[PDB]
Symmetry: C5
Subunit: 395 residues, 5 copies
């Protein structure tokens, strides 16, 4: 024969090739497909829908017993490229699919002179994963991707690994960083699946373990809270009888309610329930309500409503004791009868204002004591909250 080019080899491979039959000379021998995957980027994590969208570079190889030739008599050709849609291709899919991703089509494969067939392709995966958000800013997710043949049983198609699992799990080569998620590892494991007894299938499960970067949410959830706490603290400097303390506190409570309502949408709460962030927000709500109740009580105490005399049973241990326990602080007759009324009226006015002064002093002492108690409680809460981050970070 002549030597036109290598294309006649293709003819010798595809003159009478049937692409609908599994390529084995003995039907009792299963076709083994060796696969591996490299993660490229974590595209999306929908917590409320429990959906994970990722991108991978996937490659696989198997053996075709009808595509073998001698390199001699073909100008020492050892491998070539063949269109994908002209040979048998296994139907390897992922169990966890909930949608069909958009990925480009690769129309060529390699064939070697010993039946070695290799296939490279990129895949966009939209899978269903169970996400635990119990500790939302510092959660670690552990999803799974299970590769298996949808139809063929283990007697026809078996799945192995292209390379060792040790180098598969420690592989971060093309991964895209600074994208709110950090790829920890990808651990492979082989299994034999069977719902109903009579049919058994080969499955290769890749456990993808990833970790969230908390610094994205470290300023959107912390600074407004401490700002509202510090303005609450500075609000106590107003005197209780000024009259605008109650308006200040109710305005602050309204602002905090608006904040929590407008922020709770961005923090998902699914599965077992809300994360501990909701618990801490509820604690802040309780603290604000306690402060408002103390303000209401002291305003009620220092109010002027034609009060009675101050009670001695709550004066000896409230002014004297608290000073040391805590920080310290014929015509004549007509003239006299006329002037007696003026004198009596001025006396009763003076008595009323003296009673008001005593009640004001009692209220001031109580306000100072409650301010000190609230300040100590706030400091203790801040310390016991920051110690958790301190012990978590040093790990």
């Amino acid at each position: 024969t002549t030597q036109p080019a290598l294309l006649r080899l293709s003819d010798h491979l595809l003159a009478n090739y049937k692409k609908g039959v599994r390529p084995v000379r003995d039907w009792r021998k299963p076709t083994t497909v060796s696969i591996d995957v490299i993660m490229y980027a974590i595209l999306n994590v929908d917590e409320k829908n429990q959906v994970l969208t990722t991108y991978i570079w996937y490659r696989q190889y198997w053996t075709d017993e009808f595509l073998q030739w001698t390199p001699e008599d073909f100008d020492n050709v050892t491998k070539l490229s063949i269109p994908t849609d002209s040979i048998w291709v296994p139907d390897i899919l992922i169990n966890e699919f909930v949608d069909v991703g958009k990925s480009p089509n690769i129309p060529y494969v390699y064939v070697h002179h010993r039946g070695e067939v290799q296939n490279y392709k990129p895949l966009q995966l939209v899978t269903a994963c169970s996400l635990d958000i119990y500790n939302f800013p510092f959660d670690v997710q552990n999803c799974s991707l299970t590769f298996t043949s949808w139809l063929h049983t283990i007697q026809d198609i078996n799945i192995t690994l292209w390379r060792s699992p040790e180098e598969v799990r420690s592989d971060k080569s093309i991964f895209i960083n600074q994208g709110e998620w950090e790829l920890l590892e990808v651990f492979p494991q082989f299994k034999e699946f069977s719902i109903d007894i009579s049919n058994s299938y080969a499955e290769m499960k890749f456990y993808v373990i990833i970790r969230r970067r908390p610094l994205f949410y470290a300023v959107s959830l912390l600074l407004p809270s401490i700002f509202l706490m510090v303005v609450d603290i500075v609000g106590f400097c107003l005197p209780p009888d000024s009259g605008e303390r109650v308006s200040f506190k109710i305005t602050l409570l309204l602002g905090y309610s608006v904040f929590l309502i407008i922020v709770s949408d961005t923090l998902p709460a699914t599965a077992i329930g809300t994360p501990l962030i909701g618990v801490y927000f509820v604690v802040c709500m309780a603290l604000l309500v306690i402060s408002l109740a103390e303000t209401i009580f002291i305003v009620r105490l220092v109010h002027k409503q034609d009060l009675q005399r101050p009670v001695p049973d709550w004066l000896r241990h409230l002014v004297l004791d608290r000073i040391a326990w805590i920080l310290c602080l014929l015509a004549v007759r007509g003239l006299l009868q006329e002037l007696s009324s003026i004198r009596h009226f001025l006396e009763k006015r003076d008595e009323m204002r003296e009673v008001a002064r005593d009640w004001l002093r009692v209220g001031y002492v109580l306000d100072r004591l409650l301010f000190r108690i609230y300040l100590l409680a706030v400091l203790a809460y801040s310390i016991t909250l920051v110690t958790l981050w301190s012990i978590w970070h040093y790990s």
Copy 2:
């Protein structure tokens, strides 16, 4: 003949096979397709659009009378794989479709040596369902999926079940949990459908009964309400004549209105109307309006506007009776003529302030009585609201 491989069997099956003709030797015998379905995950429930999106694993089998062979003379081959697009396939669809889902294509099927043809595929279903949200947090939905042939009548295609309905309905093997919906059951039923008389079709209806998990909405709808109720309760501690009580109440009402407006979007209301949650919110609105009206009335009562003498007809039964019914509490002439004016002015001032004091006492008594009544009403409402959850949960 020689023995190249099993592929010649495929040739013997596909040399002169026509895929456009229904595979029966006698045209009077219908082709029976036995199907079954396993639910995988509930993807979405759009209440306002009345749309249900689910994922299922579907499989079916039928008999092809032109794909039969003897296992002998073919190296004892009992079954093989054939491309799907080379044989006749029934057109089984779902009546309730409103859109086309994205599902992967399976290019292979099994064929056994007796004409047995089996087909496995995953399906994403976007169907139309009637959703009842009368009891929104605890609703149970009952949707239907009807499998039928779109064209062929019962004289051509008939539908049966692969396995017993008892094991079909009690099947939760691959279902994905912690996704806001719990799969209760899937009940199958066969029916003969016919709009117009002359044409009758076979239908297999699967009733999918699912239940919503209420704990997702148990913290987003309850804690703010009780928080606003408790701050309303603590707001009554302010004296009526302080002046900031009205501002406090109107600010609280504005906050509650903002809350209800910003939350009502997340609670759908369709079909028959709003759920009972709207009724309970309206009840809370009425309670808040009653509290505001009581505050306005008492502020009007205790106001100083140069009032008249206190009425005896509303004093004997308001102070004395309420104490026991409810909880208890030549130059001379010129000098006299001059001083008489001062005495009279001080007398009239004292009379005015005494009248004001009496009115203030009456207002305080009324405020205490209304506070007790409102507290009892709130307690009764809370008890009669929690008893419904108590009786519902223990079931």
Copy 3:
């Protein structure tokens, strides 16, 4: 010949069949297609985009003169199924398309022994419609769907109806209810269309008349309005000189503005303009502004600013007349010289407070009169608003 099966009939129909030529023996005879449609569900009505999305079950039939056979010599076969993509199919589309819907493909059709060819398919339609929202909660929409051949003129393809128009228009058999829209009717009409003179086409127009259910918007637009009206009414019980009336009214106005802004997005306003709901909201705005202006005027009137004596020309007809027209309500010299100053100062203080009391009484009378007038106006407006719904509902 032998009798393998009916499939040879298919061969006899498809041995030398050309699917690119119109199936008529005489080219002067047009091909008549008889069609009909059953609505299934109204999917979406985008008012701002003027788009209607619906789902229909469509079927059609025509005559193929190259697909005729004798039932004898073919085992008395009268009809069979043929793949759709192997025969000629008319290009019937809808003029009003603005997008391509996603509908499943039906790969089979019936053929009878006289050339009768029937085709069933479901269609998702996304069309452009002119929507009138002049009376938004009670609007009735009248859209059109025009079926016609895109290329062939009336000399090639003509369109008729499968069944009588009377049974077409009175057909609600598979329609999905409780979906915010009620299907009133579907009226068909035939027409001959022609933009430019030389080309005339056959068109079949289905007028789809549907009606909106108002109860969906009967609680989202009515209860907050009446709630704000009733709190406005109860706000008048505050005395004009209390000082928090103005703050109450401005807070109520701010809340109403927030409500209208946050609700106007959900009410579309397109085409000719806003519905009458905007007019009624503007009327409510005017009423609230009138109430605020009355409050401002009365507060200005009852204020203490060292006023002059009360005017007699606005006292005789303001207190006396209004009572019946409306509801009723050597050293000596030094001592005298010294005491004269005190007497004069007390006299001028008493005169000032008497003037203030008179002005307060005038303000109270005016406030009562304006309150009665506003209450009557509100009652009249409510009656004349509810009478429209009363006369509309009983129809």
Copy 4:
């Protein structure tokens, strides 16, 4: 020969037809395609993305030199229908594409007996346009659609017009109105395009000029502004020393800020910058700030802080002049020594209150003058704003 039907003509046209070669007998003659377009509906105008989405009905014709036949010997057939995918079709596209629209496929074309080939199809176009929003409510947009062959140069494919440009530009026959946009005209123009010297292409540019209907935004941007202006005007009726004027003004400013923030999203601002609507809103902001500053100044002026005597240098020209310039308005000794203190104290109290009264009168005069000035300024601004609309509308 016999006379089966016209289909043999199709055979005579498609026995040895090659659809991959340009249909010319001489390769030096370009293939001329005559096209035209009718707009159907303006679907979307994304200003921030600078994207225009439209729907058109497009048709074209050219000459195929291998599809000619004699009407005689073919039963006087002059034209017929041929599948689109069996003949050569030019690749005419639009330069401005940024996405692929979804349009139905038309599988048939006409062929006449002289090689005339005509093609009708609907097209959904998603193109990139430069939008100028300098005058946002009354802007006129001028977009372009350029039809050209993507590959073939002017030596192969040339583009002309099916009909005269005069009847093309004055064509509003199927356009959908009441959709926020009015189609003004569609002007065609031919051009020869060439980036790099060696290659020249034929282009047909259609300038689509459209106009926005302002009445859609005439109620969403005007009524709230005039409402806030009129409530600002009525807010001046409060006396300066009442105390709630400042709260009223700050609440109004907060409401206006909320309005502008919640509305500015719906008004896009791209390219050269914000439209004049932002300038007018800034003017309203400046007016409100001026009003607030005047209120703050007058409240500071009329406040009681133990002031000094009123200044004569700012009293002669402030009360007297403004009235005409603007609108007008042994024991004895002890007794005397004792009473002298009371007399002196009452004298100093009277002096203080007289000083306060004088300052209050000065503040009232200044408040009236500033109110008149602000009213005149508001009237002038309203007139000079409405005159622009008056002169624009009458054009």
Copy 5:
């Protein structure tokens, strides 16, 4: 032979052409593809998803050794058009793909008489890019697009440039401006890629450098801030003892909080953290908190709570020194015994009011000093903020 037309040339090129084999006569010679790209429009920059969407016009050429002919004997034809799907086409893709864009298909290519094959097509690219937003309004982005063959190694396919890199980088000919992004340059670079040792591929990387236009965000982030600053400045004109200063300040703080919450969504914060805009906003928060604290302190100082005598140790250096350091400002006995009480009461009232006056003067002096200090600090901050823009712009 005869001369029908040029189409026989196509036959001579496609009689026995195999499109699945790489077109080289010697398999050891790689196929070189020369490519180039012209950017058309920047479609989208998703910062939170780190996604870049662009549109390009791409063209490439290579050599096909089986598509060569002599121009003579073919009527001097030098080049022609061939369908794309009938010849070998290299699989050149982009590494950074995360999705599949929608671009039109071009069904024709040129072939010259020396095997020259050219291919033109438009491409919509959705790629993953690392975006740095450290200086958000003035950021410059530097993305990469890497063209390479997905399967073939450098022994089969090699990539070069169609034209010189100098004219590639300085090419802005069809780019669409006024779209929030300015194209700075496109720099090409060749590289040899290899993850694992044994396989090496050719890559052509285009670095696309673009710049954001800040004027889009120059009015949405600056004018409200300066407006709130100027109203804060004018709020200091209120006297400290007026009573509405605290309400004014808390309302302003609530408005600023609402502004920052409603604006922070439109400013993304990803990767390394928030831009300096957040730092400047935090600085504004600190300034507002300082102003509020000063107001609270001065209101506490000037309040009347039955204070003690003014302290001399904080009066000599607070009134005298500050004036120069800063800007300046038997029966008888009964009658005497009776009148002594009145005299003493008036004396103590006068002493109390004198003490209040002294404290008010001290508070006024402190308020003026703090106002001057705050004004100077605000001016310094404004100058040191505007100097950065001044030095950045002149570059």
